Scaffold this active site. Structure first.
Site, short mmCIF file in Angstrom:
data_model
loop_
_atom_site.label_atom_id
_atom_site.label_comp_id
_atom_site.label_asym_id
_atom_site.label_seq_id
_atom_site.Cartn_x
_atom_site.Cartn_y
_atom_site.Cartn_z
N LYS A 15 -6.93 3.55 -2.60
CA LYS A 15 -7.10 3.49 -1.17
C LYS A 15 -7.22 4.90 -0.61
O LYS A 15 -6.43 5.78 -0.99
CB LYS A 15 -5.95 2.78 -0.51
CG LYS A 15 -6.00 2.77 0.99
CD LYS A 15 -5.04 1.80 1.60
CE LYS A 15 -4.77 2.11 3.03
NZ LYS A 15 -3.66 1.35 3.64
N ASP A 58 0.86 -1.17 0.00
CA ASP A 58 0.00 0.00 0.00
C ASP A 58 0.93 1.26 0.00
O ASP A 58 1.48 1.60 1.03
CB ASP A 58 -0.91 0.04 1.26
CG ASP A 58 -1.97 -1.05 1.29
OD1 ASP A 58 -1.86 -2.09 0.60
OD2 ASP A 58 -2.95 -0.84 2.05
N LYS A 75 -9.98 0.34 -1.41
CA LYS A 75 -9.77 0.04 0.01
C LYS A 75 -10.07 1.30 0.82
O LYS A 75 -9.45 2.36 0.61
CB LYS A 75 -8.33 -0.44 0.25
CG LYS A 75 -8.02 -0.74 1.75
CD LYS A 75 -6.69 -1.49 1.94
CE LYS A 75 -6.22 -1.40 3.43
NZ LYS A 75 -4.93 -2.11 3.67
#
Ligand SMILES: [Cl-]
Lengths: 220, 218, 216, 219
Positions: free
Chosen positions: B155, B89, B185
């Site tokens: 995200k 991430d 996400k």
């Protein structure tokens, strides 16, 4: 203690994730007008800081703010910053490594960055408010000694991003006694007034990290 | 509305505090296997002991500030993947995006894409900062750039920026911008089942949680 | 040994600076026809090898790169799908007696590749020509101390030459049964191959594998 | 025709053997100062001790094979410059040039350029390989890629490729292609004062040598 004299202790700083090149250009202009010692910016902003003036003293951070980067990554970052014109590097330790008692690891992490910058002034952020809240005074001293043994030029209190807070006069005193004038001590995080600034210096700090420098100076 | 096991299956169970020790990470892994979550998410230096602790592992890159040069983010991401991270991430340079340097954001994400090989790459856009400081269109642009650079997820948040964490409006904007070709996400400040369900209904397909037990009991 | 058994020991190798993606694809095709253990290619070629079992090199051929760079290189290769990494030591470090440095250099790569097979090229022909047998053994033990899975003789690029029977025999005596031993460099015939296996090699690095197999 | 001190001023006095030690590098530096050369050139891990030897240091990146991804070359270059290297001599991926991927070669050079900041960047095109395996126009295209990516020099050879090193023909082609906007460094198999002066006459503005003393004695 004069306005010009206090300003000579100061790293005038902008480290927000949203900072733009134009923000960094205005930071450098304000630094020059205030007569401070250096600007401190985020690593990818070093070109912009160097280009915004003539002979700008630029400090950059490395492994910042979490300290949670493998040592090779912190070194690589520090070296790119020096290659782009940074005179100084303020790195962050793996704070969790200090708290687990892995002082060898902390010392090697700092030695890795030390070996990569060579020429540069290296300051080590120990996150003192986190060490003092989660461990003890003794742990803070041990981390300072690791910084010295690894060749650091400064120990430094804080990132300004940890929820435990920033500089305290107790942390600075503890850190100053531990290095004994052999390394500098930079107080940082939450230094918002003249009185805050003077009390950090009185406690042993030889450099200050400030974002609101003008207001601090105006308090004089 | 989903069962406990189904909700868990959406979750990246996360510890990213600077003070985290190996012991903290080992307790996190044990707790993730008990809760039946999708993955753990740990800081890059904690990846080897998470992987060895017997759980799919995600790690972060350029995290949380996003203020690292691309090559540093790529180097960090390669090391974590080689140590056993299945997913990364990464955080964008939020300032680059606010300045309008979308080709630079994309190249930053492409550098990381090239370093991680086939690993799942999630791009943290720091939506609450983009929406506070610019506008919806800027959030859409950043997402599209992430897809162009080969990301697998977009995200919302690091959980560390003062502008906040996931919002429903941010999640819905992001889900439209990627049109179900990438995951979304949602992360940061999701503390209750209702928060969790609000993000999945808005179009999230993964959740980043630190307090997963309290959400699941929900 | 049969054709198939001998092939099973071989890392089928192209490392030339002028190598193209098309050269690498023909190497893989040839590897699978010959039934070899692995293909060995240069780090930027790993994606094309994997998309066409792959070993890559690291800090190769000089060994003269800082540890973090070799580790970065190795990690990128594993991330693109290399199952094994063959690294080169700082030969000059070993010759100065800095075995702590050589070990630390190998442990850095070890910590960056996770579960990959790690082979350490000791450049045995240089160590024997410029130092002594004892130095070659110390380098092998540093590789064991650092977590390496194999020791390997040669890059095939050093003027001092390649694998010798004595180098392999020393290395197998020193760390054999605990680490694999890969003989590489100048292995041109069936007889050369078999002589390295008899000396204690458990893997072979060859470029002209077809010719080597044909000699059986 | 240059004097000894003038020829020396063109020289990067070089040691790049895998077996080199810290002691070898310190002797190199001492010899460099004695001879009056432009610079010493050493391998990347040897830079800090070469710099600490206390009298200009060049290093190499992705050397000698050129077979390293751009990020590795850039990482390596950054570290050397941070340790005090004033110049970096990088190696292109020769097989990428041969496959006609000049955009990729350009990007590879641009990567190293953005890592070194203000350092002198030299690009090694391995001219003897480009000429033996391709043609003259390919050499010219690689030189253009280097210029476009912001290189300060183009450079003939690593001195480790089996196709050889510097030639008068390679040097003339390169100097024509860059037209005095970049420097041209001749390197690899420069064995005599006559070899050196032929490279200079062909347009080289820097020479990479190992046997510098024996070259200078030939004047
Ligand atoms: Cl001659």
């Amino acid at each position: 203690p004069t306005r010009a004299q206090l300003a000579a202790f100061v790293d005038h700083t902008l480290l927000k994730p949203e900072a733009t090149a134009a923000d960094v250009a205005a930071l450098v202009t304000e630094a020059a007008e205030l007569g401070v010692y250096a600007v401190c910016v985020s690593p990818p902003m070093v070109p912009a800081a160097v280009q915004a003036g003539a002979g700008v003293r630029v400090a950059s951070v490395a492994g910042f703010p979490s300290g949670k980067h493998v040592s090779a990554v912190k070194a690589h970052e520090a070296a790119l910053a020096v290659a782009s014109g940074a005179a100084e590097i303020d790195m962050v330790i793996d704070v969790g490594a200090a708290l687990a008692g892995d002082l060898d690891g902390v010392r090697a992490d700092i030695a890795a960055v030390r070996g990569a910058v060579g020429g540069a002034v290296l300051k080590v952020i120990v996150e003192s408010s986190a060490l003092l809240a989660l461990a003890d005074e003794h742990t803070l001293v041990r981390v300072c000694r690791a910084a010295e043994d690894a060749g650091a030029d400064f120990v430094k209190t804080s990132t300004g991003f940890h929820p435990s807070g920033g500089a305290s006069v107790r942390a600075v005193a503890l850190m100053a006694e531990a290095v004994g004038g052999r390394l500098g001590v930079k107080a940082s995080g939450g230094i918002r007034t003249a009185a805050d600034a003077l009390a950090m210096l009185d406690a042993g700090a030889t450099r200050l990290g400030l974002s609101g420098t003008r207001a601090v100076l105006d308090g004089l």
